[PDB]
Symmetry: D2
Subunit: 260 residues, 4 copies
């Protein structure tokens, strides 16, 4: 089928890419980076994220694969020594696919911009104090005061979510998790404190109180949005598809990255 | 149908019980506390828990209802002023039912004892140091050192789970959440720290390292178990059923209890 | 003596200022905002902070006083109804003074800039990843990876420090407290996690690893510093002096602000 | 002078004790475990704690020394390979001494019992719910609801205090730190959450609300006290004295134990 390979750009990653291409040349495979069916990332999780966002509009047409040249990653979870055996089983096809949920972020202005996040989306102030009203399924839940908020995907919970006290969530759970960043709690400002986990079809919207300018991040991309009326979060109907090469459980991946 | 009513035992709760019984006497309803179809709890969440455990073996035959005479509860979420309108719509039937997931706890000895928890199950030491190996789906995840662990249901996340930094989880999510209690982390002992959320059919087992005696709690019940070989957790195949009286969302329930 | 009064600028604060000035006119007191001996702040804690920084170079010549027109503050801790009795005992003099410790921040470039903080000083990245080596009394303590760090004064622990999990410290303790902001901890990056409390004459220096540009805050002032070689923290030899009007304990102040 | 040596009791520790005694026999030193001037602990921090509590009544007459046969400890901070050079400089004397603060715990009944803690003192319930009123310098600060409380010494902050989110405090600071254990916080029960650090001469007293039986720990010793009227904490006027063998800073000790 059609395939393509992105590289971190350093020496080891570029050479592993060329060796896999040459190996692919021994099969009924053609290199197409416009309409690929297989997208291979070589580098780290960040390299995988860029590969994800390069092909956001063809997610249901692509099975992704990640190779880590550095330390183990949660998306780049195959060692370089498995590249040759990766090429062989990829070329035959007949492999299984696994799907992770994604987070949809909609921003409303005085038009409307929608983004897809594989890890998380964060909202911070543009300089002054960050204050938003949190509305869950149209009911006002809290007035949040602090540094900002973070809405994470399941597989994103091992990233920024984890640093903010969030729980680690198995990616087979179609959910999204919201965590707080340095919240103020006194007798006048009150926040839940606890991380919140939302199921599918629940809608979490952030609404400004004073300043309508916010710094909004979506994975690597961080952009200052102005005259924002609403930021609403929900589990996306779209999913990312991975090619299943062998058994590498999420919890084993979690153990290897944080325990030993 | 057959119904019964439990009471906290104080003055207000006993009188509300007798008024509802008299009101029920105006309908095709008979009081049976052996094989009831409707179980009404009057008091607090603790009163509801006891009502739950009184009828553990007939969960799929019973729709529970909670009335709080004191402050609002997460299971006893109807005010006493709604008792008369509760009696009327209960007697007709034709009401909707909602179901929450439950946690199954299995304890193995050198026989085997199984329990059902509506909120959570905790494991602590019997006096000395608490040390267990945590095994997830047969792979060794961590050696936990500290005060103990807590495995919570979705609806249980607003109880003890919340106090231990756990996330709040919508009860429509079939999952269980594991949190740590005062864990030791140095260069030799390592724990994940983060709360873990497990989907259905994932099995979390605790295995002793030195002492085989543990203080095991299941909701209100706390029992010292001796010569324990294994404690394994998993989302139960059984569910608790609530009679749906009107719209009282979980997140609104969360807001009322903790925010305002 | 010479005195001056700053105001939040809103209606209630300007009117309370004019009433206190008129009351002061009934005594041997002259209004001098160049070399005042008494500085009265009317508004909130932020109004007090600006009053503090307006007169940084004459701290040992000035006894500060804070009046809150809004909610209670930790520096503006006198109600407006006490203004007339404040004017009277201030004009006589013979009052007691209390002193709080201050934090000295030194920034080194490829000259050198020194600041005094009443609450805290924070260091964040300029956009990319924030990475610094933490050096305590010339020994390398940790390589910090995350959002940033916060070094707080004792009286500053009830502000930003508190939101980051820091401890609340009685201001009679000559110390400074360092807290982490969303730190990364895996098998390769390690941080202490815990807040650190340093005594007098201990020096904490932050040293860049890659990017030498940092966003440095000192109370309200937040400035982007470029080509930074070192940021070193230590308890200042200077102290802020408050005029003691009656008994308002720090722990009572803490209770009123956060408990009830 | 008079000296004695305690041992963990395992093989390596008993043999190191006998070698140091034989080495001491080459000097003007006599073994007295009744009125020793030097107390050497061989094993771990727990071995040092028992050595501390064996000689509580002669603290100002004794300079303690800790040797770790296992991993590094905060009190047993000298390697076994330094035993021979330890014996030599100990026998001459003329060494420097360093002093750490201690925590005094007073328990009142319906007589009165006082204890000295080197690490911390914890209070938990005897089975049911733990509820106490917290009174600071005679003013009521909070009604605490949860698992329990922990009052730590400076050098004790690296133990249990650290696991409960407490700050790490340099032992030259004469202070005590109070942390919470799994506290309940809703709209009706309120706690400060943050750890509290108290200076010398501040008195923190715990007072029962319902149950007057509490499980009180002081370092290793944990005892069930009945009919308790009050538990009050304060920094002790007594201090533990260490013999200063060379430069081993607390922060270096902290780095070695938790970072690398
Ligand atoms: N999903 C993930 N889980 C754990 N680490 C991840 C991650 N995605 C990325 Br990119 N990283 C590493 C950089 C950010 C670290 O906070
Ligand atoms: N599910 C729940 N959510 C919040 N509170 C609950 C609860 N169940 C019970 Br009983 N309570 C109150 C007593 C325990 C408080 O920690
Ligand atoms: N020292 C302090 N303690 C508690 N609140 C303070 C404070 N100084 C200021 Br300004 N504030 C309020 C604004 C910042 C809130 O985080
Ligand atoms: N002061 C201390 N600092 C760090 N560890 C200590 C300690 N005292 C003891 Br005993 N230990 C180890 C056992 C308890 C671990 O929580």
């Amino acid at each position: 089928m059609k395939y393509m390979i992105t590289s971190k750009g350093d020496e080891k990653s570029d050479l592993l890419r060329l060796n896999m291409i040459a190996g692919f040349g021994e099969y009924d495979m053609e290199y197409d980076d416009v309409e690929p069916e297989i997208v291979i990332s070589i580098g780290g999780d960040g390299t995988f994220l860029s590969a994800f966002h390069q092909y956001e509009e063809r997610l249901d047409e692509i099975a992704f694969i990640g190779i880590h040249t550095g330390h183990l990653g949660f998306y780049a979870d195959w060692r370089p020594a498995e590249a040759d055996k990766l090429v062989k089983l990829l070329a035959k096809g007949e492999y299984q696919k696994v799907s992770y949920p994604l987070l949809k972020t909609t921003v409303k202005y005085g038009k409307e911009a929608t983004y897809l996040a594989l890890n998380e989306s964060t909202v911070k102030s543009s300089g002054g104090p960050f204050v938003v009203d949190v509305v869950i399924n149209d009911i006002h839940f809290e007035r949040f005061r602090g540094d900002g908020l973070c809405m994470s995907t399941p597989s994103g919970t091992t990233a920024y979510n984890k640093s903010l006290g969030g729980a680690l969530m198995h990616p087979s759970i179609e959910a999204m998790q919201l965590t707080e960043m340095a919240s103020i709690n006194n007798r006048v400002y009150r926040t839940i404190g606890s991380p919140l986990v939302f199921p599918k079809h629940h809608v979490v919207s952030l609404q400004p109180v004073n300043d309508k300018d916010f710094q909004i991040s979506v994975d690597h991309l961080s952009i200052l949005h102005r005259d924002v009326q609403e930021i609403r979060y929900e589990v996306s109907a779209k999913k990312i598809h991975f090619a299943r090469f062998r058994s590498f459980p999420f919890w084993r991946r979690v153990h290897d990255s944080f325990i030993e």
